[PDB]
Design a protein around this motif. Structure first.
Motif, PDB file in Angstrom:
ATOM      1  N   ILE A 124       0.792  -1.268   0.000  1.00  0.00           N
ATOM      2  CA  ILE A 124       0.000   0.000   0.000  1.00  0.00           C
ATOM      3  C   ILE A 124       0.796   1.274   0.000  1.00  0.00           C
ATOM      4  O   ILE A 124       0.303   2.336   0.470  1.00  0.00           O
ATOM      5  N   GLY A 168      -1.086   4.166  -1.053  1.00  0.00           N
ATOM      6  CA  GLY A 168      -2.208   4.658  -0.244  1.00  0.00           C
ATOM      7  C   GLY A 168      -3.181   3.559   0.118  1.00  0.00           C
ATOM      8  O   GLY A 168      -3.084   2.454  -0.414  1.00  0.00           O
ATOM      9  N   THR A 169      -4.126   3.849   1.023  1.00  0.00           N
ATOM     10  CA  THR A 169      -5.069   2.811   1.496  1.00  0.00           C
ATOM     11  C   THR A 169      -6.398   2.754   0.695  1.00  0.00           C
ATOM     12  O   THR A 169      -7.172   1.824   0.832  1.00  0.00           O
ATOM     13  N   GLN A 170      -6.657   3.756  -0.133  1.00  0.00           N
ATOM     14  CA  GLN A 170      -7.901   3.831  -0.866  1.00  0.00           C
ATOM     15  C   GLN A 170      -7.961   2.653  -1.836  1.00  0.00           C
ATOM     16  O   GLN A 170      -9.034   2.151  -2.151  1.00  0.00           O
ATOM     17  N   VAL A 230       2.796   3.627  11.010  1.00  0.00           N
ATOM     18  CA  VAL A 230       1.897   4.525  10.286  1.00  0.00           C
ATOM     19  C   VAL A 230       1.125   3.706   9.244  1.00  0.00           C
ATOM     20  O   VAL A 230      -0.103   3.829   9.124  1.00  0.00           O
ATOM     21  N   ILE A 231       1.842   2.881   8.485  1.00  0.00           N
ATOM     22  CA  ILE A 231       1.184   2.003   7.491  1.00  0.00           C
ATOM     23  C   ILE A 231       0.113   1.072   8.108  1.00  0.00           C
ATOM     24  O   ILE A 231      -1.002   0.990   7.585  1.00  0.00           O
ATOM     25  N   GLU A 245      -3.005   3.292   9.351  1.00  0.00           N
ATOM     26  CA  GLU A 245      -3.819   3.777   8.241  1.00  0.00           C
ATOM     27  C   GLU A 245      -4.550   2.625   7.609  1.00  0.00           C
ATOM     28  O   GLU A 245      -5.686   2.775   7.194  1.00  0.00           O
ATOM     29  N   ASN A 262       8.088  -1.521  -7.267  1.00  0.00           N
ATOM     30  CA  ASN A 262       7.680  -0.818  -6.053  1.00  0.00           C
ATOM     31  C   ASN A 262       8.717  -1.161  -4.995  1.00  0.00           C
ATOM     32  O   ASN A 262       8.896  -2.345  -4.664  1.00  0.00           O
ATOM     33  N   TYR A 316       9.066  -0.362  -1.697  1.00  0.00           N
ATOM     34  CA  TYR A 316       8.733  -0.201  -0.283  1.00  0.00           C
ATOM     35  C   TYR A 316       9.599  -1.138   0.564  1.00  0.00           C
ATOM     36  O   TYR A 316      10.069  -0.743   1.645  1.00  0.00           O
ATOM     37  N   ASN A 356      -3.086   8.749  -7.644  1.00  0.00           N
ATOM     38  CA  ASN A 356      -4.294   8.592  -6.823  1.00  0.00           C
ATOM     39  C   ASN A 356      -4.420   9.662  -5.739  1.00  0.00           C
ATOM     40  O   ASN A 356      -3.422  10.203  -5.244  1.00  0.00           O
ATOM     41  N   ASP A 413      -5.141   9.865  -2.663  1.00  0.00           N
ATOM     42  CA  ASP A 413      -4.603   9.761  -1.299  1.00  0.00           C
ATOM     43  C   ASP A 413      -3.105   9.406  -1.254  1.00  0.00           C
ATOM     44  O   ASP A 413      -2.594   8.981  -0.214  1.00  0.00           O
ATOM     45  N   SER A 414      -2.413   9.563  -2.383  1.00  0.00           N
ATOM     46  CA  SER A 414      -0.995   9.155  -2.469  1.00  0.00           C
ATOM     47  C   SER A 414      -0.092   9.916  -1.518  1.00  0.00           C
ATOM     48  O   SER A 414       1.039   9.484  -1.246  1.00  0.00           O
ATOM     49  N   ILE A 453      -0.507  10.319   1.678  1.00  0.00           N
ATOM     50  CA  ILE A 453      -0.565   9.775   3.037  1.00  0.00           C
ATOM     51  C   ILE A 453       0.732   9.073   3.473  1.00  0.00           C
ATOM     52  O   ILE A 453       1.100   9.132   4.650  1.00  0.00           O
ATOM     53  N   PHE A 454       1.407   8.408   2.535  1.00  0.00           N
ATOM     54  CA  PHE A 454       2.724   7.829   2.827  1.00  0.00           C
ATOM     55  C   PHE A 454       3.837   8.534   2.053  1.00  0.00           C
ATOM     56  O   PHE A 454       4.932   8.671   2.565  1.00  0.00           O
ATOM     57  N   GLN A 455       3.565   8.970   0.830  1.00  0.00           N
ATOM     58  CA  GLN A 455       4.610   9.501  -0.044  1.00  0.00           C
ATOM     59  C   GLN A 455       5.081  10.882   0.353  1.00  0.00           C
ATOM     60  O   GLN A 455       6.191  11.278   0.010  1.00  0.00           O
ATOM     61  N   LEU A 498       5.145  10.887   5.475  1.00  0.00           N
ATOM     62  CA  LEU A 498       6.328  10.240   6.062  1.00  0.00           C
ATOM     63  C   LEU A 498       7.605  10.963   5.609  1.00  0.00           C
ATOM     64  O   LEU A 498       7.684  11.465   4.475  1.00  0.00           O
TER      65      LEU A 498
END
Ligand SMILES: O=c1cnn([C@@H]2O[C@H](COP(=O)(O)O)[C@@H](O)[C@H]2O)c(=O)[nH]1
Ligand SMILES: O=c1cnn([C@@H]2O[C@H](COP(=O)(O)O)[C@@H](O)[C@H]2O)c(=O)[nH]1
Lengths: 317, 317
Positions: A164, A167-169, A212-213, A216, B163, B165, B192, B194-195, B197-199, B202
């Motif tokens: 994710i 994001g979580t959406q 945080v991940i 959320e 990815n 992560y 997206n 809500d991108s 929220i982590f990108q 954090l």
């Protein structure tokens, strides 16, 4: 799935998840020893698949009285790939809370390996054993809908893994069709040596990225009403990530954790199971792949892990 | 690939990347209008594939004088899926620096769609047009090797998306076989809603997550000596992420950016191309999928984007 896992748990009395990640050496070596031994494992697959399973993809050739000839290199490879998978299952299913198939391993040969993957998921559906597709899937909502169709409609998977970072959406398009609901496990903390570089060094207001991940992710799980509908968003937390598994169980007492890294990657099963313990022990899926699939005896490998887990859970009860 | 992209750039005079993400409506609707119009687009695929292309997966039926019958639902679906893809290519290839195929769209039908994906990549290999598989792939090194075999050996892709992560050490198993080298684009900032929220939320020592990710990615690219070997690790930066695209071009003047989000997702092509500008303009791949594939005329859609890009690059020169 919450009910399915609880019922399975009470039937096999373990949280062992068997990883089925067959590489080219595994398939070639299984073919080799089946040729030498007169196809003993294949014959067991044919009798012991109960009522008996009929593979949808190349079912006739797989169930055939005699295997394909060596001149038919592709057919022969398909035949022994499927039967390797079936063999690992039949040898281990008595000890398995779930199986997790990593998608990568079913791709190098093109469509051939996807037909195998279809047959594996169908057989496990036939046996009603809980299934996980390890794909670490991620994209924008519209694209994710198509991954959902593959994983949940076509393969009929109970669950998958998801990443994710975006994001979580995204969870809205993998976990829901409004009316059908599905379970997924999001990457929180991974087993690789350098996983700390983003998962721990990045932070927000004192909280490490992985926290945080997780936070959320559960915020979204609740917004999606998954748990009212029998499903969940769980967490992938590496078997060697002792501090993080403790932290995650602390912050989310009722979460489902999928923990790879025992066996080939030398994760400390007892240390991790103690740290991540839930009395509802289907909530720590201890994945073991190569330590079972590459062992001389997958049945005995599986049995050994089954016993160790049993013993550690007794310590913890 | 750096040379391949530069040569292609000078031949088509654009940085337009055509996205080929066919959904069920696209295929069904193409079949529908081909039945009605007497298979005009199919006939063009057969003559204009130059020397002519011979599909490896179901080549005879695809090249056939008459399409499969409606009773053969699967064959018919395969036939029109392949020809839809071939049609988008033949209609647009004059305007295309690259094509990017999103893996998700080739999965909902099982092995069928992977054979289609194989045919698409083979045709593009035949035409020598630069290729991207959008898979956002991620896993531990051993598993990633198998994704590499699919993407780079089997499909013979020029590149993929990834990815990170999990960490950057993963790049060692996707970008190298010691002796063969491959290019990938890592997710930095996505389109997206809500991108952030982590990108962005954090951080480490004042630097936003997306920056830390870009920095660590290039540190690894250098350790891998990709660029000495003609390859790179690029960045996926959304076409609507104006601030981030500016920042990324600032910090890494010579990086390769893959920028989706123009068209269907309403990204501001001019604003993003200005912000992410390199005089070496193959270093901003502007991906357009649905705005081309779902338009009444993909050729004219492609031509329009080709012209807009031409005009903006003139502004910037
Ligand atoms: O942090 C993670 C996340 N996923 N996996 C996956 O779990 C399995 C571990 O298999 P093994 O038991 O053979 O090491 C493989 O499928 C691997 O891609 C990990 O190993 N570590
Ligand atoms: O941040 C991102 C990353 N990847 N994609 C991918 O780029 C394509 C955009 O297609 P479109 O032009 O049809 O929106 C799709 O394949 C989508 O999964 C995005 O849209 N945004």
């Amino acid at each position: 799935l919450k009910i399915k896992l609880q019922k399975r748990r009470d039937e096999v009395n373990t949280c062992l998840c068997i990883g089925l990640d067959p590489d080219e050496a595994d398939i070639k070596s299984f073919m080799q020893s089946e040729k030498q031994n007169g196809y003993q494992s294949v014959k067991k697959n044919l009798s012991n698949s109960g009522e008996l399973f009929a593979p949808q993809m190349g079912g006739q050739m797989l169930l055939a009285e005699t295997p394909p000839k060596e001149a038919q290199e592709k057919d022969e490879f398909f035949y022994f790939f499927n039967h390797f998978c079936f063999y690992i299952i039949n040898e281990t299913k008595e000890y398995a809370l779930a199986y997790k198939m990593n998608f990568a391993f079913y791709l190098p040969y093109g469509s051939l390996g996807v037909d195998v993957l279809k047959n594996v998921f169908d057989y496990l559906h036939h046996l009603n054993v809980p299934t996980i597709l390890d794909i670490k899937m991620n994209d924008i909502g519209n694209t994710v809908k198509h991954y959902r169709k593959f994983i949940f409609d076509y393969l009929r998977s109970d669950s998958c893994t998801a990443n994710i970072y975006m994001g979580t959406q995204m969870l809205r398009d993998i976990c829901l069709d409004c009316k059908r609901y599905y379970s997924t496990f999001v990457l929180v903390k991974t087993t690789n040596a350098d996983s700390h570089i983003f998962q721990n060094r990045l932070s927000l207001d004192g909280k490490e990225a992985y926290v945080v991940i997780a936070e959320e992710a559960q915020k979204m799980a609740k917004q999606l009403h998954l748990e009212e509908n029998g499903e969940f968003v769980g967490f992938v937390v590496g078997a060697n990530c002792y501090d993080e598994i403790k932290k995650i169980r602390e912050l989310f007492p009722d979460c489902y954790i999928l923990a790879p890294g025992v066996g080939a990657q030398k994760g400390d099963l007892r240390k991790m199971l103690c740290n991540g313990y839930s009395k509802n022990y289907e909530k720590v899926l201890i994945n073991v792949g190569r330590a079972i699939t590459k062992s001389g005896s997958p049945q005995q490998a599986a049995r050994e892990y089954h016993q160790q887990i049993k013993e550690v859970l007794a310590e913890l009860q």
